[PDB]
Design a binder for this molecule. Sequence first.
Ligand SMILES: O=P(O)(O)OC[C@H]1O[C@](O)(CO)[C@@H](O)[C@H]1O
Ligand SMILES: O=P(O)(O)OC[C@H]1O[C@](O)(CO)[C@@H](O)[C@H]1O
Ligand SMILES: [Mg+2]
Ligand SMILES: [Mg+2]
Lengths: 298, 298
Amino acid sequence: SLIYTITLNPAIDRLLFIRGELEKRKTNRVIKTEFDCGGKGLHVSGVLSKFGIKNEALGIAGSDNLDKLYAILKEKHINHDFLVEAGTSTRECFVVLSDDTNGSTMIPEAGFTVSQTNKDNLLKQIAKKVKKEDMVVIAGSPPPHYTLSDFKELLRTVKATGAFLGCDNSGEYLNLAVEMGVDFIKPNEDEVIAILDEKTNSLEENIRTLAEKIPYLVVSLGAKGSICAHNGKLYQVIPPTGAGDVFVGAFIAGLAMNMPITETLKVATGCSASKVMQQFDLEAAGKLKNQVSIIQLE
Amino acid sequence: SLIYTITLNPAIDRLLFIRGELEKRKTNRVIKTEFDCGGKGLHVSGVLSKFGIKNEALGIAGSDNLDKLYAILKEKHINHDFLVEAGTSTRECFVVLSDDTNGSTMIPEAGFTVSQTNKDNLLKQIAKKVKKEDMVVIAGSPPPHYTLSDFKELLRTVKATGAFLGCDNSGEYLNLAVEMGVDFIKPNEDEVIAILDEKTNSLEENIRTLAEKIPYLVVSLGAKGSICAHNGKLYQVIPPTGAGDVFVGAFIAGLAMNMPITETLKVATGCSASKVMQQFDLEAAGKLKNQVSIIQLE
Ligand SMILES: O=P(O)(O)OC[C@H]1O[C@](O)(CO)[C@@H](O)[C@H]1O
Ligand SMILES: O=P(O)(O)OC[C@H]1O[C@](O)(CO)[C@@H](O)[C@H]1O
Ligand SMILES: [Mg+2]
Ligand SMILES: [Mg+2]
């Protein structure tokens, strides 16, 4: 079988290294510039590959900076079959970083408007490629004007093939994903409250309730860690940006390698924490795996 | 005669429009992206052209994004004869702006290392082009590793042709410019103190003193306005980013059109203020010209 990632609104991450903090009306000189691939799906493909797990990235890229995007993907050993929109450029997400600090300021471009033709090409692309034994991971939110309506066809077209379907989205797209019934989603506390529009029950109850529709539910609680529901059980995951994408990637890898869920959660969490410490190193992420603690909630 | 601008470290300004202020560890979504030419020299060429004054821009651009730089220049009606460094890209200066606010955060890339060959090509380029009746305006500081030594040849090579030479630089380059004896420079208060390394005399005296070497000395005092020395006289210019580049451009234009110095100062100052009000419009800058007041210091 195979794993497919779908990055509707890909990007090129441009790391801008400056000295100290980022003043907000001052001039901040860049010491050096660094590039990496952007888009949730892509980040997820990057993790899968480090795990020696086969996968292919799908999405819509711009023509004008394609060569640059491909060099990065080749470097991150990411197999892809992108659709290309002529006369446009993949957006960039400027990441103002710093060795002198541990912060990061994000300034992502909105991305371009996708042509109707490439929307349809993505649909058959999925029909022609995805099998029931495969897994699909639509990650990152849609580019401007890729409507909820468009998103609906996308999800249904995937479901129609019977493959595992995970979605890392937000806003009405996440809600929509839930209503459609995907196998995986990683909402934050508040997104959970939003999806249900319920504010009087405990979060726990919101999650157990939501687990009735999503079989691999993982709710991020920020620094506190996470809560994952699966097979009737609820787990509190306690750890010792892009951290969320790596978590997804790691989590998918675990399921792909078919390892215990509690175990998958320790690996996912070890890799996510491994980055919140990096400007990730898989080897380095492995030392954190067994520092992660799981607490089953009864 | 003709005017030449020299932008040793050109750039492409990428305006990033977000909502409200710029948080510094948050994600700031870009509403729309806009491009403009970067580099002091170029900005100066942009002003000259709006004044219908003939000029040509010189400098070293990268190959990978040349087409994009040329489209902008064509749009700003800027004539150029750039030298090109193969396999490299012109740096970008990210300008985080906002309609909801009147601020701007600058994040300029350092730029690339220029090849020895293009350093030399710039030198003969100047010898073959510049005549005594022309004006040269080296503006913006040098790219990484374009040494003080390199800068020395540049300036001397221009002087050797007998043309008017203005320099808008900083750090040791500005000092060097002063020692070399250029016709124009626009240092800020502190740069003046630095050039002389004198801290016990009034700024006025520092300027009159410095005027002995620079015949068109203009010292910027920030919000307070400016002080310009010329022909033995000292003027306090009182007004009603990129504002400095436009001032230079406007000032050069005045001298080019050979209009009174006090007058040149009112135009330069009107145009600079015209931008500190813009996200400049020449027509709009004209309404501010006669709101500028000149006070001769005796
Ligand atoms: O796919 P999106 O939802 O548009 O997000 C893209 C952004 O996500 C990040 O990976 C942060 O999670 C950034 O590096 C940037 O690439
Ligand atoms: O030529 P430099 O000294 O490297 O400065 C370039 C920068 O100058 C600015 O025009 C501000 O004066 C920015 O827009 C950016 O292009
Ligand atoms: Mg999210
Ligand atoms: Mg200056």
